[PDB]
Amino acid sequence: HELYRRPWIHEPRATNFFVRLITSLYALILTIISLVVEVSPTWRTDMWLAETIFYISMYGVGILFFAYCYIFIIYPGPYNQLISVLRKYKIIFIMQSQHNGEGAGTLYLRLGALFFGSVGIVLFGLELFLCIENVACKKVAIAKMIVAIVFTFIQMHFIFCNSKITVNSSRKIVAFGMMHLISVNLWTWFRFVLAKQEAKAHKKAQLKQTFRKYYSSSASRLFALEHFGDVATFLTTCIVEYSLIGAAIMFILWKSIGQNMRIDCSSSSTGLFAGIIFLIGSLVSMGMYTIFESLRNSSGAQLVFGIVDLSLFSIALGACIIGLWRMRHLQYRLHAHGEVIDEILLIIGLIGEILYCAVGIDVFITCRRSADLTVSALPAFVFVIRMIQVVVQAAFILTTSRLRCLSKYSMKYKPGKEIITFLLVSNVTLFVFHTFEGMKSSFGFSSKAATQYNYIIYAVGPLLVFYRFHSSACLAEIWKHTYSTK
Amino acid sequence: HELYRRPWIHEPRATNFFVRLITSLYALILTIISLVVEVSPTWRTDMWLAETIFYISMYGVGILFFAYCYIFIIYPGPYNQLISVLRKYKIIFIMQSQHNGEGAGTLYLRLGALFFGSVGIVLFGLELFLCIENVACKKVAIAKMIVAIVFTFIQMHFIFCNSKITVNSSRKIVAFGMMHLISVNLWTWFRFVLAKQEAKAHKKAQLKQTFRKYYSSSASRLFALEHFGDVATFLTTCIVEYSLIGAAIMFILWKSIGQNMRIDCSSSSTGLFAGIIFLIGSLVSMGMYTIFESLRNSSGAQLVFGIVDLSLFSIALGACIIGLWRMRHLQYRLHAHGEVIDEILLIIGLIGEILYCAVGIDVFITCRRSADLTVSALPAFVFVIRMIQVVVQAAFILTTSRLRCLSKYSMKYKPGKEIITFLLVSNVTLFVFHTFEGMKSSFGFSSKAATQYNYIIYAVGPLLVFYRFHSSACLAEIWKHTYSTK
């Protein structure tokens, strides 16, 4: 006939789309089945053998795909040596390195993946220790923890070294493996957010009892959650953040299938000093709350401590507003210069933060209704300011990540760079502050003043996201890209 | 300096992206807050005034935006007349029609939106009748139902007549309104899927009791759900499907902001006859199960009835397989020729169908464990075949929607057109069959044979999606586009 009149099976675009679609559908089926299995209560108690087989199978297929990659794509050296020996005096195909430079994720994202994977492996090892010291747990728990640790470590190495992967080899096998890795990461994320939700009920009940005794008369489970205090909450949010990052990186790698300067610390001083002041204030607040039992029990102090949190969030929000106003002078990007991975992860962190704040606000009101509204509304104000701050900061981060300093005025004068530096430092301090807040109720709020000024006790919902880490990574990318010479 | 060195506030692309981002964030915040409010148990019981205010506010802002559109964009006639009178002898700006032809959604999608919106308005009117006959309900329920009906009717008209909307007018106002409409539609969808989940617990408990008595010794709530039997389930899935379609249409309209043949029934006979045979078999099965109490109580019959369902799903799956094999000869699309709206809705229906089937399989096993595995595994096989059929059909629909008949052989001979016609007819019959299945447990499974062959009783989970309607719409689009002369 004419050109482009061949069967779609021979068309590279059509068959690439078909493999893409098949792998995506397979992932979707696995993720839905994993969610159904995890929620189901008859799979953790009765069908323990089936649940163990599913767990071992998910991690084992992940490890098999990782081994296939390391042997046949990333490091085909030993395979080439074996194939040469076979040809020498055994039998009578060779692979090539073909190393690439497709760095999918940002360096900050991969470093965070390393840190969170290490913390998750620490959590897995702690479970393993608990199940070793326990007789209730059996040999299958040992295998589950070991295979989880092995998969997590191998995926840490794969994520960090995701540039030397040449996905154009074994395209369909790599697509299926990437989708299985996404399914495994999402299944781990769902497992550990269901585990995090178990502590929500206990915290809620404890809060209701503590509230009542002070205002009266006017299906996944990890043993460390309820054994190692509230540190297990930090470990579990670390592992869910690691799983989210890994799933995003694997999705970027899977999407790439089939598709053919120096630190400029200039104009980063006034913001850096303000960021250091923010860090010093946050650290002083954390230390005063932690080491001084007298301070955490007084009402003056608990008022001042809550005012400190409100001031921190208000200062961050005002910094974002001033940054938008100053950076209004910048220029839009001439062409794309980023991966949607960072935006997607930041939006997921934003969703988690808004959910956390809304649940806290709902619990706060609930509690105030049960006490005839005798509680100061400062915790509600802190929650609302936190939600407004995270929303405005997400908008600011996206807008300024799509901004550049192209004009001569925007080059000699850097509008907002001080604000960007301050926001990056303050986001690191808010990350460590939110880590501390997960252990604030470990001290014990025996202070009646804590029931009327401290807002952490009202946040019984789990914090499933590290929005501050993703915000810091995006802000560092903005700082190093938006204010660059080009 | 040079070109493209102006502030991003003046850059049309940058400010369009900024308005897009702000409206998307606003929608996200509203949807998260709506989900938190609906799940919260203290908003339906204690904070009834706050819940009513939120309900009325969401629907009222939707209606205000709709009125603004109808007055100032779609039908600016009366506004022009008023503005002319003002200029005549009152004061001393005119709007223009600027009607467009941007048909966002498919005709089948808009017709389904009309049908489902009508059914949802019927459900709202039934509630209104119940609350009128009830003294427990107060005047606020009247207002809630009335405003829901008004919003649903206006959005029906807006969705059907979404071509004459010129979104390029009042770009930012229309963006905010489209995002508020998406938030309202998602909030309605979440409300009614939470309502559908309430019947899940009752059905599960009833199934456990009925199973036990036959094998012993070897936060949203709608009053019609538990009052009008299982017809309320059909009405509620109709309203959730309408809300999903409306949200998708509004998203397409919002995405369009800022961006500057005859029926060929040839070669559609053998498939049409097979589709008619499929319809006749399905209707005979439905009638025999409905009108004959003797048949629905016998074991021979209940076995044969389940075998009929298995045969229907197996025939549909085999039709999809044969269609892929035959249409392998077709040609890939030269360029895009569809809106992601249909693909997104089909994938959501697929997710819902897989969730339904997986929950049914989980319940089936659970039940068999409680009876020492004395139940035939036919219901599990039916569920598995249904899930496989829907997955394979989704893959087939997407692949063949990205296919064309460009070669001369693919023109004179139409590969798969018979299969496409048969699949469309059989999907209409499976739609009516799944509608019937929602009323199959209304008869009452007093037949012990129903507890061992009929698989509907094990599907205690709600069917939240009309996957068959979306499949029929996509298949009709394929039939009218893939096998066209061009």
Residue numbers in the entry:
A (entry chain A), B (entry chain B): 47 to 138, 145 to 270, 303 to 344, 358 to 583
Give the original sentences from the paper that presented this experimental model.
Several recent OTOP channel structures demonstrated that the channels form a dimer with each subunit adopting a double-barrel architecture. In this study, we performed structural and functional characterization of the Caenorhabditis elegans OTOP8 (CeOTOP8) and mouse OTOP2 (mOTOP2) and illuminated a set of conformational changes related to the proton-conducting process in OTOP. Combining the structural information from both channels, we propose a working model describing the multi-step conformational changes during the proton conducting process.
The WT CeOTOP8 was overexpressed in HEK293F cells and purified in glyco-diosgenin (GDN) detergent. Its structures were determined at pH 5.0 and 8.0 using single-particle cryo-EM. The Glu325 side chain points down towards the intracellular side whereas the His567 imidazole ring adopts two alternative conformations. The His567 side chain flips up toward the extracellular side in its major conformation, forming a salt bridge with Glu325. In its minor conformation, the His567 side chain remains downward-facing in the cavity and exposed to the cytosolic solution. Firstly, TM12 of CeOTOP8 forms a bent helix at low pH with a kink at a highly conserved proline (Pro559) residue, whereas the N-terminal part of the TM12 helix before Pro559 unwinds to a loop at high pH. This helix-to-loop structural transition allows the Phe563 side chain to rotate upward, vacating the space necessary to accommodate the upward flip of the His567 imidazole as well as the downward rotation of Glu325 side chain. Thus, this structural transition appears to be prerequisite for the formation of the proton-transferring bridge between Glu325 and His567. The other structural change is that the residues 244–270 after the C-terminus of TM5 are disordered at low pH but form a helix that extends seamlessly after TM5 at high pH.
